[PDB]
Amino acid sequence: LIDSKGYGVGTPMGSPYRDKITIAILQLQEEGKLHMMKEKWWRGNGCPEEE
Amino acid sequence: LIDSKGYGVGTPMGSPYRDKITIAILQLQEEGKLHMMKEKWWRGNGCPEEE
Amino acid sequence: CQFELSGADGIVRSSQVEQEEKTKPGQAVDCIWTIKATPKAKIYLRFLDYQMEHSNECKRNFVAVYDGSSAIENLKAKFCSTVANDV
Amino acid sequence: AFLTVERMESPIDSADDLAKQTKIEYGAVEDGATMTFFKKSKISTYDKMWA
Amino acid sequence: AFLTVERMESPIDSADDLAKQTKIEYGAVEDGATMTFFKKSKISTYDKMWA
Amino acid sequence: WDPASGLNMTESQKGKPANITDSLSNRSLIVTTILEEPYVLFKKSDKPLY
Amino acid sequence: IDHKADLAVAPLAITYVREKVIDFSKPFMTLGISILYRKPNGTNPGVFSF
């Protein structure tokens, strides 16, 4: 990786939803479920054509 | 890689430094000084003549 | 506990107090050493191990080297920082 | 050619290869942060690892 | 193997080629206005020399 | 004014001092670090550092 | 928490349990756990190096 930059979930300048959405994202990461979705959608189409 | 965590910068609950410091972190990150800062300390001697 | 240590070379023993004057560690302790070379000879001091860990500030613990006799006339060097130069 | 330009390669080259091998006898720091991940990690690709 | 590995040895002939090499330790008469040139230099190769 | 003391003029402290701080929120920020190996380590020198 | 300090710039993993009772800024570098092994010798097995 030459450079790094992430993604996010945009919310307005003032929103009491950001704290709980952050809690939820860190939760999901701790259970690793978002990794499961990633492998379902990147690796899911990943290796059906092993050459 | 297997997992991912993130080293951060602490701040007391509800202190206004968060929104004034994350912007500075992003400025440094996308302004390019962070990679040189990392390399100046992690570099070491490098790869010797095992060739 | 001023002690003599003279000759041509020698090692000032690391914390040599348990046998010369066995002092309780609770009270502050200090012991001085006197060195004499062979006739018509100066001295070179090279530390082989030195770590005054408990502070980088020196009102409590340190090691000092004075030139000549054990008087205050001219401190050669008192060293408190992690590393210690030769003198 | 072999005795002139020789390139040796690793026996293991992936995280999964550590499992189902049972000859390298790897390890980790005692109950630090790695064990915390391997515990409760339900991908089961590292549950053999933890076992 | 011996002959064709010896024949393609490259003895040092320049400062940068020296900088890549590691075994041969460097030096200069200290603070004789020579090493200070490496001290205050801006060029990358001379910077790694001074490092 | 006197020969001895000099300028005893009353504005040296104004009736309402301009430079007054009623906020103590940000003073001498107490950051905190730790002695990790390539993160925060004691500098290598010979003379004392202060 | 007890406000005897402030922003603590030091490697401090952003984990779930801390996040309830602290506030962390956005990460300034990422992490992960990886293997560490010795690269191989050219010492051939010698049983049948042919």
Side-chain angles (χ1 to χ4, degrees), chain F residues 12-23:
Chain F
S12 59
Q13 179 51 242
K14 293 179 179 179
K16 293 179 179 179
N19 201 53
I20 36 135
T21 325
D22 289 345
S23 59

Side-chain angles (χ1 to χ4, degrees), chain E:
Chain E
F2 277 171
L3 274 296
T4 197
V5 72
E6 172 272 353
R7 188 154 213 271
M8 70 184 189
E9 69 84 23
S10 54
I12 59 172
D13 205 61
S14 289
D16 43 0
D17 172 35
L18 185 59
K20 291 186 177 181
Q21 200 271 350
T22 64
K23 314 169 86 87
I24 323 296
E25 300 157 348
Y26 293 162
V29 58
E30 61 86 20
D31 293 355
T34 314
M35 182 179 72
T36 69
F37 157 84
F38 283 118
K39 176 89 71 162
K40 66 187 62 57
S41 56
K42 301 289 95 175
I43 322 300
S44 50
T45 53
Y46 306 152
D47 281 329
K48 72 159 274 198
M49 294 299 290
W50 165 239

Side-chain angles (χ1 to χ4, degrees), chain C residues 45-62:
Chain C
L45 294 83
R46 201 168 75 78
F47 292 104
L48 283 176
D49 188 11
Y50 156 79
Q51 180 55 222
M52 295 299 102
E53 83 286 13
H54 191 192
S55 64
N56 189 359
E57 61 76 10
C58 274
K59 294 332 181 313
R60 306 177 63 250
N61 303 342
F62 77 101

Side-chain angles (χ1 to χ4, degrees), chain A:
Chain A
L1 265 66
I2 297 183
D3 171 271
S4 162
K5 85 174 78 83
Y7 282 160
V9 175
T11 44
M13 181 37 59
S15 165
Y17 298 92
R18 177 260 293 256
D19 63 358
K20 49 194 68 179
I21 198 64
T22 294
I23 299 291
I25 297 169
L26 272 70
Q27 268 196 354
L28 277 296
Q29 162 70 63
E30 201 201 20
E31 287 92 8
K33 303 180 187 171
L34 63 87
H35 173 86
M36 293 177 70
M37 283 74 75
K38 170 167 177 56
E39 66 183 1
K40 164 163 158 270
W41 282 85
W42 265 264
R43 184 224 44 69
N45 69 103
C47 53
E49 279 163 338
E50 186 276 330
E51 272 178 346

